[model samples]
Target: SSMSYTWTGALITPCAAEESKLPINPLSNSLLRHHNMVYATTSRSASLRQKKVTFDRLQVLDDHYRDVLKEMKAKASTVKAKLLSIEEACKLTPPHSAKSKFGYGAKDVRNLSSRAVNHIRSVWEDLLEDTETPIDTTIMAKSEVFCVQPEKGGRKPARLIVFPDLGVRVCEKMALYDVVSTLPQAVMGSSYGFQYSPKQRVEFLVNTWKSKKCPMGFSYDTRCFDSTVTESDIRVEESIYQCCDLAPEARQAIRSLTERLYIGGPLTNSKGQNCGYRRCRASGVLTTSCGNTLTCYLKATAACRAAKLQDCTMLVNGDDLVVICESAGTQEDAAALRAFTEAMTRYSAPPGDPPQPEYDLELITSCSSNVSVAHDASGKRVYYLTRDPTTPLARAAWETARHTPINSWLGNIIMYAPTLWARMILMTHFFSILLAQEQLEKALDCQIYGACYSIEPLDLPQIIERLHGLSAFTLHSYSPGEINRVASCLRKLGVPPLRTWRHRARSVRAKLLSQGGRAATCGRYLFNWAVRTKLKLTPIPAASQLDLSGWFVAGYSGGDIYHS
Candidate 1:
């Protein structure tokens, strides 16, 4: 056999004539043509960028930035740190997390008397007592690659992460996660990337447009973010914490953890090779929790000003960045972008390639998403943020047979509630499967932004409406590209197409309407698209009236808005 175990890469699909010739209106037709050209151009540009980066070394940090970073770290060291209880930290772990190598699940760790707790306690004590010795992390690389179409490259190289034993992870929460989660927000404020939901992000973009005299948008991609975190960068991160008003023990613990765990650690590969040491960010550590977001923001904010990019507002989540700025005309725009690239390089955050500017809002692709047009029940054209549903649907399918964590289907159904793929295929299949298994009452885990929650199937209607607005139920005519992508993802994932989903939803809807109560509400809201005569949108009084508080963790600054 010619095949190897490693992923060869994504299989590229040649553009088909049938897909190109799909009937579309003037706006969609023009947009589709533009999109095709953009993809082709960007693909070649990216290839060139990758080649250049491979050969030519780009120096990404300067003395000025380092000085500024040093000052920032000094400020961070003065802040107070509050260490959490071991039991409390253990409670924060997801119930469905992977079982430990040390003979215990998260449930066992949560319990007081279990062997898992005892083992974990000893580990914590060891960490607290042995401040001088370096704690070796189990270094393994894992894939965070997502599926997308108009297939780009095959699977990229897996990311490297440090997996300390489960006990160490709990101690990490107690000592580091609190600072990692909160301090970045305090320092960066609205500039914090992981803070915003997709809805909130769109709102911010829209508001920027509304607020600006001349709005131009572009997104920057950092080449290999985790790989870019240097030993100095890790030290700079530690410097920020040193400024904080931390307790004596907390400060000492931070320093010990930084030297032993964060700065650089031994990496042993899955094949048992001593891969030597890593000086960069460990993809799976407490240091990594807010490390990328904080560092990226710090670098970019300074770089944006240095580049003389006028009124540039940035939203950065790790390596992914979207910048909305005042338009500087054609020649100036090009010059400004070049300057921006140079500044970012100097700030230790070079673009994956040169940044491409978008004058038209519809053409901008950020966070692997772009705005697309579709028609609503009233025959009005509606714009929504859409990406290829390949990854989410793939996970949804895998969830059927395995103990696959993350209810991506539910999250997609909420975030992209108005999207054709989510409404028709995702909602239909997942709901049908859960109904069949009688798991509607089961509170499955889902996430929005970075917050975790356990959501029930019964809350779909309310969730959809809240996230997407009322247009979710009424959206009907989907764009050709949208429908085509959905079909393509289904075929790729070995799931049935939109038509088959409609067929399944028809039966699912019937079952729900027959049973009445919340199930009937689910039928009416979720499967409405599958029906010929859509049921009159009736408000679910219970769903509308109920305060969702702890049920959902949403918004830009991590507030439980449902409570207020």
Candidate 2:
């Protein structure tokens, strides 16, 4: 059997040194009592994931893959991707980026301090010095929280993060940011995932679903997608990048980086022990998201051809795939899906769950969520996307259980802004915490589609308006199916019923209005659904004026990305 990783049996250690305690006093019991489901990934659990993700594969590209590759390269040939400057790449580094071994942290680099700049210049000089050198990378177990899935197992393992030094990451952005930004859109067009915002993504899915005559929809879940990326696949990905019209310096840099860092690297753990080697795609590079999106789309497109799926349309967001197509009869459609599964596996993008044909619009779950019907205050039927709260609630409990650097509740508040439980329980609970700390103006970090953001609590009203529209403030009469799931989850997690939260939000809402300013604006706009006589919800003047240019442009899940 082939393997994605070869271990040295060194322990994958955990780190708590970076955090200061969130107040240790008893947390409120507004929700989440039986935290039996709340667990964080650690070294031991990560071992299990290592075993699961360490499977082997060999791939042979057929005529179909060749045909698609030809078409894609032809389109890609038109793109002229420019190389970024050393200083320009330095500015793009987030303030919280990994500290460099050259004696400066992310903050120093972003500020362009002389020491950091000189060191970075030296790194770049060395890059041109010897282009074929194999760069060293660190392999660490990523600590994230999740609810234990009873269906599969109690606790999934921690994901492994393999990244190059800070010196090379900035160099990575300089060499490839433009290529990743422009080439995928040109080659894949509307199928590229990063171009759509949350609203746009849902609309595309819904409209695509509606467009089909006898629509059959299914989501293809690739098991450990990054792990399945063979070295051959990575080289194919590089060939696609080479098709783009690039300057000589950019071309040299691309080719050099491809041979040096991108193809493969050595792995070391936190303690600097030799942990293993990586022959597949490195998870934290600038090109990870873009590469995965293009590769997944490439194989899936050829798979659709191989399976004879009719008029198939795919939405790709870094390996989270959903295909909606014209259906034959039920039996025939089911067989087509089975064929798709087989072809995808043959292409080396095997499914975590075999695809199943879904006829009803709301039944096909993609992106770990589904669309549901709700209503505006005027009773017009509205379509809002939602997901079961078991995982969301569990993670929120873990964050509230302690203050972490990244707060997913803010992220959840943004994406699922129109959902019932998010507006009621998640908002009410967090508002109480923010109000208690009197830190309403303090910005906290969150992520949308894997990009990190620092968001202010007081700006909730405007952000919601800009992203979900003003009707999000006035929504009522949710579809009973969505309501039933919300209610059942509340019972499961000991959350208050909707009516109770509605009543509680009024008090929370009133308190915010009394505070006045952006805080009052938040209460007035965000909790209008709670007021006895709701204020006529109007557009928050600040909403659309803010620069939200890159909110959903792409995912950076393992790409060490941030939005300033």
Candidate 3:
């Protein structure tokens, strides 16, 4: 089925050579051009950030933060245990998953096929029966590295993940996935991270500062987050799960899976090399779902207190961290930052090259996003989340021909709905393409708040409002920096510029409104930025009362929205 295409492997359908680009239609030409610019700018900026961070050296470490971190780890060790079921686990397998090595599909796995189910049951039984043996994970490092450009670096390394057989993947979902998904939020509240949208994040930052007398904010980056997870950390994570009240089968399953899959695993590199053994985090394990979030928050929370960062508040998503606290003097701030760094280092996490502090909100970049200044319809300076459009534009082009694992266009459109690139370039190009292909009603997969979702064009207004608030519809003028990046990106990619996007958007808006129904609603709300006179926003009747806060899925179920 067209819907069953997998985007996991390196070669996602072969695209035409740069010269043999998409048809030179207005939309196609513009998208192709945008793709080109992203690669160019990303390559250039990556080199510059690499040079700066490589040579600049600063160290901050101390004992107080170390003690606090140790204590936090101790508390994590005391957490209770909870377990999952084989049936429940199988249900989580996405319907569109790749074929199993064992000659079946995700549906067969979910249906508890005698072969697939027996195979998975045996794997679990073996896991439970042999409690202490380390399970070996087949390591395959895959790269889709340019989703969004990394901070000041050229490109991120290929993501190393365990390519366990499909059966094991199902077994894993049964055993540890539930814990992975829910435990961190239980342990840390708002500080659990991974749950905030760009808007909520900005609001948290603003509100935190407004309530404090002297607010100092800074973000931290961990070099190679996945590789830093040690056997001990995995055990610690298991201990936290142990503290939960779990079903007996679930408990046994968790213990067995932890021993075999999480604590330590054998390594098999992509080239079929026997790469010895791994006692660190498996990039593809259920733990990857929560390990970094739990670990980073544990370390940062303690370190903040040890550094004497007054009224310290944190927002962490995986290894991306932003700390806002009462401002100490410059000297004290530097000293506190140093102590925080030390605590992080002791916790087996180290900062990226040249770790430093930023006094202003606009300067702090976390999750490859920085809060930038932009203008709304009323000419008010509105603060919104934006990053360079290089990666999203690049991926958008790839998505045109290939089935990408992520709907970068949709995610960007939601997160940066008000940004010029997202509104003008991303939304216009993608909708135009989808409209041309008549795939607007075809549900595509996307992720938000660390969960997967099936999104269609019909869902745009609701998603936009949920993510970016009302500003997504009303925001008009963008900052010069944003405009320039958009302009430069178009120029480099050989796409049409701001004027061309405006023209296309106007045409698209009319077409959509003419189509009426959901298409017309999209035109009114989503393409409002491209029009001269805005249309009055009407509530999306279908989604008005629908709450999507928990809409997530383990497996793809066509025509059904599942919550995890």
Candidate 4:
């Protein structure tokens, strides 16, 4: 009865016809070869995943956990969050968001239509009055394919997403948007992962690594973190929220939502069948970002004490975690990590495997990525973040073949802006596609840090400059492994070689330059690394003044957040 998922044998159906296989577009096969390298998960595999995540959670809170919770609550008490106006909240709705059951679309909400506004008002008033009605949430399978690894079977069951109704989502923003936006930073400060840009994250890790005399780093991963969230975890999360200064309406709304919805709720599937119930964290709530970060940081801080890790510095972005600290030596470092794992296990958050200490910062992977070195245009060594190219390259290949809802290639380019594959492969591929379609001026939708953003292809130079800095355009001499992985990945995917991409960039650059304006800037910046006798580089006047606020503020993975 208390399982994370309780299915009634009804399926997690797709709203429309699903694309189960990669399409063969002119560029799809060009991005990957041997289609079996990728495989999509469907609702059918949801049962398999359910078995994996369903478990009896065991936890024992010692003085370590209690003391950590006490300190976290102290920091939280200083935060103040205000409710948002309906109009302010409506403007943030993604244009393509699903329509509400009350016959209003995202457009109607954004346009301030009377029907949508009235329904939203009614919903808000009901929340104020009702203190015990469990909120309704729809659960569905999240579709994505991963690359198969050498020793491991990379095939995975589909991840399920639980989200409240559209009107309720608006109500959530009205009550808690400001809290999620501000509270994490107020409570955790720099350890709040959502507050940093990708470039900023690298600098922080570097500085923290150098701060210790014998710096050792390791990343902690919770096994299926969202499912491990128990009733106690939700209540603990709520306690943190109440510590914040809240408007009377917001305070009441927060409590009601917590009592009825957040702790546990019934789930409806795509076919409108009663699918099951959830007793853990809802993957699609506004607090999903901030709540998880707070709880994770709290648990990790407590575990660090139990393990007696010295001078520990933690960086957490969602379930992804990294801890850099002073090492006691090889044997002691290994032993300390085991103690840390045991402490986390006792907290009902266990690692996939025993975490090993890393003397080199670059060897420790956090947030599914790592730091690496490259050279600037002038042969100056510079540091950047990167990851194994297998998954991204595979996904890029899949996206190339079919018309998909999300453009991950674009997101990969934005998030991994400075990497070799992104600069040479992603930019080259997408620019070529848009050029072919004659849609360079059209804005395409992509997610960055879990929020959807409508981005135009021509403005990529400015976007990269703002997020990553001018060196993104100047980066070269990629590490041997980084380059080798890309090269081998290209070969395996049947993609054109590096020499082919270089020549293609020269052509794309010339074509973009011919268009002038923003297109020319993209050419001048994004493709400069591909050419010889390069034009003198300078800070683009546009990048400094770029308006890209709220891009990296928080990671709302499935929270249905959109940035205009």
TM-score of each: 0.79, 0.95, 0.83, 0.97
Where is model 3 poorest over a 10-residue stretch in terms of lDDT?
1-10
Name the top lDDT candidate: 4
What ranking of all candidate models by TM-score puts the best one first? Answer: 4, 2, 3, 1
lDDT (10s digit) by residue, model 1, range 1-564: 111011212221112221211222332221122222211121212223332222222345766577657655654654566887877777767665545677887778767547888887787777667776766655443323243344566333333345566677777777765576567666666766555555566666667765668888888888766656666667777878767776665677788778877776665544445545555566666666467776777777767767778988877666677888898888888888888788877655666777888887666777677777777677886667888776665445444434436666677777788888887777776777778778887987776654456788887787766656566788877778778887766666555557776787899899988888889888888888888877778555665675644332212111111111
- Residues 530-561 of candidate 3: C-alpha lDDT, one tens digit per residue: 76667777556665665765543121111111
lDDT of 4 at 94: 79
Residue 172 in candidate 4, Cα distance off native in Å? 0.7
Looking at candidate 2, the ten consecutive residues that score lowest on lDDT are: 16-25
Superposition-based RMSD of candidate 1 using all C-alpha atoms, in angstroms? 9.3
RMSD values, in order shown? 9.3, 2.2, 7.1, 1.6
Q: Write the per-residue lDDT of candidate 4 for residues 252-337, one digit (tens) a residue.
A: 89999998888988889888899877888899888888888888998999999999999999998877889999999999999999
Compared to the true structure, candidate 1 yields what TM-score?
A: 0.79
Colliding residue pairs in candidate 2: 194-553
Where in model 4 is the C-alpha error above 4 Å? none
Candidate with maximal TM-score: 4
For candidate 2, write residues 329-406 as lDDT tens digits: 898999998898888898888888777888887997878889888888888987778999877887787788786778
Alpha-carbon local distance difference test for all models? 0.64, 0.81, 0.65, 0.85
- Pitting candidate 3 against candidate 4, the one with the higher lDDT is 4
